């Protein structure tokens, strides 16, 4: 049980982690927006 | 040797030797892939027989050599780059077809700079202010023909 | 206890690699950071 737990920890764990990867992609990927919104500055001052 | 042979040394012989900037900048990226070589390759720690070894002090030593070598040629390339577009306002300065020729100039090394890396462009906010004064330039210009 | 320590080690292992990649994702955002700022 505690073995079974202890992988199924490695699994949760991972469910976790990639979860929290795939939301600061989404963040990182709003970067990129605020990368777009530095193309709008961009064109603003041409 | 890449420990011993500091930031000093190369950088004063690649910046006297002043090559090209874009295949300054080619070699430059050259030592950015041997970071990431350095970073695959180097362990943090390796055990040998009796022994716990680490190397976490030179991969990062190495590595962070390497970005001040590569950053201080970006560096030396934007001094050159700012030798050419002060050499630019100096001219639109003075007249106020070779204006446009140097607006053909400071277009193109920006657009060298941008190209070769996103990162290493907008490496002042003189150099954009420069290229929109650049700009607002031949406006004066052909003001001042006028007279 | 050999399964549980290989277990530990899996976790470390994937902790570790978690760790590189979020040093790639930080120095990422700080490029995009700084190039953006820099306007």
């Given at each position: 049980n505690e073995q079974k737990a202890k992988c199924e920890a490695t699994e949760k764990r991972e469910s976790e982690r990639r979860q929290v990867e795939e939301k600061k992609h989404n963040e990182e990927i709003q970067f990129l927006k605020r990368t777009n919104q530095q193309l709008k500055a961009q064109l603003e001052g041409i | 040797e890449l420990n011993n042979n500091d930031i000093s040394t190369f950088l004063?012989?690649?910046?006297?030797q002043?090559?090209?900037?874009?295949?300054?900048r080619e070699v430059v990226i050259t030592h950015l892939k041997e970071k990431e070589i350095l970073d695959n390759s180097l362990p943090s720690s390796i055990i040998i027989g009796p022994f716990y070894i680490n190397v976490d002090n030179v991969k990062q030593?190495?590595?962070?050599?390497?970005?001040?070598?590569?950053?201080?040629?970006?560096?030396?390339?934007?001094?050159?780059?700012?030798?050419?577009?002060?050499?630019?306002?100096?001219?639109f300065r003075?007249?106020?077809?070779?204006?446009?020729?140097?607006?053909?100039?400071?277009v193109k090394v920006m657009s060298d700079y941008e190209v070769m890396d996103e990162f290493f462009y907008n490496l002042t906010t003189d150099d954009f202010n420069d290229k929109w004064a650049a700009n607002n330039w031949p406006s004066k210009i052909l003001g001042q023909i006028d007279m």
């Open positions: - | 004063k012989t690649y910046q006297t002043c090559p090209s900037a874009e295949e300054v030593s190495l590595s962070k050599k390497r970005k001040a070598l590569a950053t201080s040629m970006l560096d030396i390339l934007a001094k050159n780059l700012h030798k050419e577009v002060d050499s630019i306002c100096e001219e003075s007249i106020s077809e070779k204006l446009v020729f140097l607006e053909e100039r400071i």
